[PDB]
Design a protein around this ligand. Structure first.
Ligand SMILES: [Mg+2]
Length: 34
RNA sequence: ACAUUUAACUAAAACCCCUACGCAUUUAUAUAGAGGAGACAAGUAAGUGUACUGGAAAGUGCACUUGGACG
């Protein structure tokens, strides 16, 4: 790009929620074949 | 281009040329028409030179500058 504005690095907060939900769904009991 | 006569027992008389200027030359004024300047009135950074496109506004190509940015 001919001109790039200042770059700010922001932490992506949303992905952590999905990661935690996945680490929980891994160990969950859902019932008999359902 | 153009030319020395009379007179002279004291001394005098006589004297007269033709060519230029124009459909030339210089500057100026008036006038058809055309065109300017001024006044009034109301994301691609920025430039220089040059070139093309476009009715314009502008866009793009090549080289150059920081009189920009890069915590
Ligand atoms: Mg140019």
């Amino acid at each position: 790009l001919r001109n790039v504005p200042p770059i700010v690095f922001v932490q992506d907060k949303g992905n952590a929620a999905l990661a935690e939900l996945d680490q929980l769904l891994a160990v969950a009991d859902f019932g008999p074949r359902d």
